[PDB]
Each structure stands twice: as structure tokens, then as C-alpha cells.
A paper describes a structure:
Membrane-attack complex/perforin (MACPF) proteins are transmembrane pore-forming proteins that are important in both human immunity and the virulence of pathogens. The crystal structure of a bacterial MACPF-domain-containing protein BT_3439 (Bth-MACPF) from B. thetaiotaomicron, a predominant member of the mammalian intestinal microbiota, has been determined. Bth-MACPF contains a membrane-attack complex/perforin (MACPF) domain and two novel C-terminal domains that resemble ribonuclease H and interleukin 8, respectively. The entire protein adopts a flat crescent shape, characteristic of other MACPF proteins, that may be important for oligomerization.
The data were indexed in the orthorhombic space group P212121 and the structure was determined at 2.46 Å resolution with two molecules per asymmetric unit using the MAD method. The final model of Bth-MACPF contains residues A/B36–558, 239 waters and other solvent molecules that were present in the crystallization or cryoprotection reagents, including one MPD [(4S)-2-methyl-2,4-pentanediol] molecule, one chloride ion and three ethylene glycol molecules. Furthermore, Bth-MACPF is likely to be a monomer in solution, as supported by crystal-packing analysis and analytical size-exclusion chromatography (data not shown). The MACPF domain contains two four-stranded β-sheets (A and B) in the central core, which is decorated by several helical insertions. Insertions between β1–β2 and β3–β4 (TMH1 and TMH2, respectively) correspond to the so-called TMH regions of CDCs, which unfold and form transmembrane β-hairpins. TMH1 (residues 126–173) contains one helix (αB) and two short 310-­helices that pack against the inner surface of the B sheet. TMH2 (residues 248–304) contains an antiparallel αβ–βα structure that sits on the outer surface of the B sheet. In contrast, D2 and D3 of Bth-MACPF, which are distant from the TMH regions, seem more likely to play a role in protein–protein interaction (e.g. polymerization or interaction with BT_3442) rather than membrane attachment. The shape of Bth-MACPF appears to be self-complementary, which could facilitate ring-like self-assembly to form pores across membranes. A model with 16 copies of Bth-MACPF forms a doughnut-shaped molecule with an inner radius of 110 Å, similar in pore size to the the C9 MACPF model.
Numbering used by the authors: 36 to 56, 66 to 276, 287 to 481, 484 to 558
Write the structure that this text describes.
């Protein structure tokens, strides 16, 4: 509203903010994993999407980053849940994600409900009577782990990312990247075969969450048979005769659908829904197909076997955006026009209680991050100086002076606005102190084709994949071409610099 342009985006610059560019069980490691848009079966190989880590390249240099271990066990787990928050009553999915990460369960819960609704015939059912069930039957044969020491993860980020993942990182929005890849990277899983069954019951007489869950607990447990459960037997789902009374005594209807993971002679595609007392399926051939380990696949996740994508990238702003987007704090559908806004940054309250501000250029990136170019010596200044930034006349002079300077390096829209505040001291924005376009060097990483432009006095760095369309979006191609080439090692860069992706 009181926004005023100080420089139109140079009109000869283009307006382009983006470009739209499993043999065996061990190949899932370092791939993205889809929660929201997957099958909702935890650890299901189908939810493995695309490679994030270039594993072949990594293992060619450091073979010890991978660590397989033979297992020979069987596992059954049953879960009953009256609603989609109760889905996580045993933290089944929660504990698969890296300990300490801020996990948003919404998408997982949404995906399960979406699947339930697609798997089971459309209903008039009174949700009060509804309870859900899940069964897992697993022949476990192996275990795969990627090294996850932070220093390992940084090395991977720097040099061992899949080039199409690097593409998505710089040529689409984080939103788009998560739609295509999913939200997590596979670091720890189990291999073998698995039968997975979902149940949908209408409890005849209980509406209490716990009572219905105990009813489902009993039903699930009366509804399958594993005789002689040897690892490394007969298996069937469905009740008959005596066991059917166990079900009908508590449920007016209980239906199920199964899906087998790996093996042969099973059910690769989720089955239509069947009444538990009417239709039984013999999985015996499928179970004994699992004696051929060639038929094995990814079947479940290790605790902490899923790492956020943010652990696999160096860029501060992408890391934060991934996190914020996952948490539903931010959502930019697609990359946009960058611009510098000269606005006010909160510093402190005067001894009269008055808010005092510095005037600051803030680069808005394609991704919509705000990179505040702060003056850390602004806090030293005396109250009356800072208060003079509230005078329209000093704002004119300073804003125009900053524009005159930054204009030498950036040909994008520069605007000023005396009524816009940005507060990084109390709060997405980032602070980069002592930004100075004159003090920079650059080098290209040969493995990844990323340019890293770094200021070795102030310890900040702007990164971008090597396609001129990007510097052109910021109208900085001239400037960057003039920047002298000076290599620094990746480890020095990420250990000693803050890196921001343009
Ligand atoms: Cl049926």
C-alpha cells in the first residue's frame, strides 16, 4: 500500500523462475519414502520412490556406509484403532522417524483414512460404531542400514546426491519436490516377505474407543492362522465355524483386505474387501515362496529408519522450508520472482518504550525465503539515530542509497516500504550480517554442478545449480561472471559457512 518501487526489474531479463526438468531388496536404501501419498502401510516397498543418495557412487568411495545384517525371524503385530488419532496409539509410524525430529502426523493419518475409504465399500455407517484393524505377518530375512553420523550425512549432502534430486532441489519448489519424492529418506529397513491386512468393523454394541479396540483385538486374533511359524507352515486369513461366532458376537460386520509384499503366488495388489466370516484366503503357497530369498523386498522400517530430507542437503533455507512445509507452517506452490525489499528491522525498545528499527535490504528468493542483509553494528547506534529511520526523509536517503549500491550487482525489482517490518531477533527469515557483494569468490562442485559463491570475510554463501536461468532470475549474471574463481573444500564450506540456495 505504501510500497514504492525504486528499480523496475530490468525488462530484458527473462521471467523464468523454474524449469520442469528396484532389482533387489538392497536398492531401496537412500531413496525417498512417501507417507501422505503412499499406500499408508509402514515400510511398504511401494512407498519407496526415487533415489536421494547416489548409493552406487557413495559405495564406490566408502563401502562401509552400507551395513547389511542377516536376520531369520518372524513377526506378527496387530493394531486396533477407533479413529485416526488412535492409529498412532502404539507410535507405530512415529518411532520409524529419526528421534528428535519434529514429526507432523497429519499426513500419515490422512493417508491411512484415504486408503481405508478407497479399500472399503462406501458406507452409511455411524462413525461411533466404527473401529479399524491392521495385521502384519512378516518373514524377516534381512536388515539394511545407511550410515547416519551427522558428519557422514554432510559428506553425502555435499557430494553424493542423485542428480535428479539435485534437479528437484533447484528447479522446483520444495512443495513440488515433496509431491514427487515424498517426505523422508530410507536409512533403516527390514527385508523379507509380509502379508498386510486392514479391517473395517461395525461394533454392534460398544461405542467406547477402548471397548471397540478390545473387540477388534479379539477379532483380528481369531481371524488368521499361522501353524508352525518357522522362519528362513500353513498360513490363512479368514474365520470359519467356531471362530466366526467370536466375531459375530461383537460385530454386525467385519470386512478385510490383504496385500502381500514380495514372494510369489500372493496378492501384489490390495484385494477387494471381503467379509471375514464368508471368505478365507490360503497364503500357504505365498509363505513357502519366501524360501527363495530372490523374491524378498522391503517389508517394514527400523526404529529411526526414516530421516528428514533436510538432513541430506546443505542449504539452510531449503532445510528450514522442508521443515516448515512438513509442519504446515509454510507452503509456496511454486518458485516465484525474486526481489530486494528495503524495509525496517526491529532492533530494540527505547527507554521510553518506543520500538526502534534499522533499515535493511531483504532479498526475497525464488522459494520465498527472506534473506535479511543485517548491520550487526546497528545495535551500537544511539536511540536517536535509530528513531531517525522513522522519519520519511532519512528513509528516502537511506533506501535510495542502498538501492544505488545493490543496483550495481542486482537487476531485479528493488522496492522500499517504510511501514513493513521484519523481526528476526524474536522470530521465514534469515539474517546474514555484513553482506558485501564486493568480497566474494566462487567455485563449482564437479560432482553436483552447484556453484558456491562465498564471502570469506563474513562467512556466508549463496549456492545454485549451474544453469544461467537461475542467476538471470535474480538479475545477477553479470555480477557473478566477474566473481573470481577460488576453490575451497566442501567440508570447509559447510563447517564454516552458512549456505543459502538461490
Ligand atoms: Cl465376501
Amino acid at each position: 500500500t505504501s510500497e514504492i518501487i525504486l528499480q523496475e526489474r530490468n525488462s530484458s531479463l527473462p521471467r523464468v523462475w523454474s524449469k520442469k526438468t528396484f532389482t533387489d531388496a538392497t536398492d531401496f536404501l537412500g531413496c525417498s519414502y512417501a507417507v501422505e501419498n503412499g499406500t499408508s502401510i509402514i515400510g511398504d516397498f511401494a512407498n519407496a520412490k526415487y533415489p536421494v543418495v547416489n548409493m552406487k557412487k557413495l559405495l564406490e568411495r566408502y563401502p562401509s556406509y552400507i551395513n547389511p545384517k542377516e536376520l531369520r525371524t518372524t513377526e506378527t503385530k496387530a493394531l486396533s484403532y477407533s479413529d485416526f488419532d488412535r492409529l498412532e496409539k502404539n507410535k507405530t509410524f512415529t518411532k520409524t522417524v529419526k528421534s528428535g525430529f519434529s514429526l507432523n502426523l497429519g499426513p500419515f493419518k490422512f493417508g491411512r483414512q484415504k486408503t481405508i475409504k478407497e479399500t472399503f465399500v462406501h458406507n452409511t455407517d455411524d462413525s461411533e460404531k466404527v473401529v479399524h484393524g491392521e495385521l502384519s505377518i512378516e518373514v524377516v530375512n534381512g536388515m539394511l542400514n545407511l550410515q547416519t553420523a551427522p558428519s557422514a550425512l554432510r559428506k553425502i549432502a555435499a557430494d553424493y546426491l542423485d542428480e535428479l534430486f539435485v534437479d528437484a532441489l533447484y528447479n522446483s519448489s520444495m512443495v513440488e519436490l515433496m509431491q514427487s519424492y515424498g517426505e523422508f529418506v530410507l536409512t533403516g529397513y527390514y527385508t523379507g516377505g509380509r502379508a498386510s491386512a486392514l479391517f473395517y468393523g461395525v461394533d454392534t454394541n460398544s461405542i467406547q474407543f477402548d471397548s471397540k479396540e478390545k473387540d477388534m483385538d479379539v477379532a483380528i486374533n481369531a481371524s488368521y492362522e499361522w501353524k508352525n511359524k518357522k522362519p528362513t507352515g500353513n498360513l490363512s486369513i479368514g474365520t470359519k465355524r467356531e471362530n466366526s461366532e467370536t466375531i459375530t458376537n461383537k460385530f454386525s460386520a467385519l470386512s478385510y483386505s490383504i496385500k502381500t509384499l514380495g514372494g510369489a503366488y500372493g496378492y501384489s495388489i490390495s484385494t477387494p474387501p471381503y467379509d471375514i466370516t464368508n471368505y478365507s484366503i490360503d497364503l500357504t503357497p505365498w509363505l513357502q515362496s519366501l524360501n527363495d530369498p530372490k523374491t524378498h523386498t522391503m517389508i517394514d522400517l527400523q526404529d529411526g529408519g526414516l530421516y528428514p530430507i533436510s538432513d541430506f542437503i546443505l542449504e539452510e533455507n531449503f532445510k528450514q522450508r522442508y521443515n516448515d512445509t512438513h509442519m504446515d507452517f509454510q507452503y509456496q506452490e511454486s518458485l516465484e520472482e525474486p526481489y530486494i525489499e528495503i524495509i525496517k528491522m526491529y532492533i530494540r525498545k527505547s527507554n521510553s518504550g518506543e520500538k526502534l528499527y534499522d533499515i535493511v535490504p531483504v532479498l526475497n528468493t525464488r522459494q520465498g525465503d527472506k534473506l535479511i542483509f543485517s548491520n550487526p553494528d546497528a545495535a551500537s547506534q544511539s536511540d536517536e539515530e535509530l528513531k531517525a529511520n522513522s522519519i520519511p526523509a532519512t528513509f528516502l536517503t537511506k533506501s535510495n542509497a542502498i538501492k544505488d549500491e545493490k543496483s550495481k550487482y542486482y537487476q531485479l525489482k528493488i522496492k522500499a516500504d517504510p511501514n513493513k517490518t521484519i523481526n528476526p531477533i524474536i522470530q521465514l527469515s534469515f539474517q546474514i550480517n555484513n553482506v558485501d557483494e564486493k568480497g566474494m569468490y566462487k567455485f563449482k562442485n564437479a560432482n553436483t554442478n552447484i556453484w558456491y559463491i562465498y564471502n570469506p570475510t563474513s562467512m556466508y554463501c549463496f549456492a545454485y545449480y549451474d544453469d544461467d536461468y537461475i542467476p538471470d532470475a535474480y538479475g545477477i549474471l553479470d555480477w557473478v561472471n566477474g566473481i573470481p574463481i577460488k576453490a575451497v573444500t566442501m567440508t570447509t564450506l559447510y563447517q564454516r559457512y552458512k549456505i543459502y540456495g538461490l
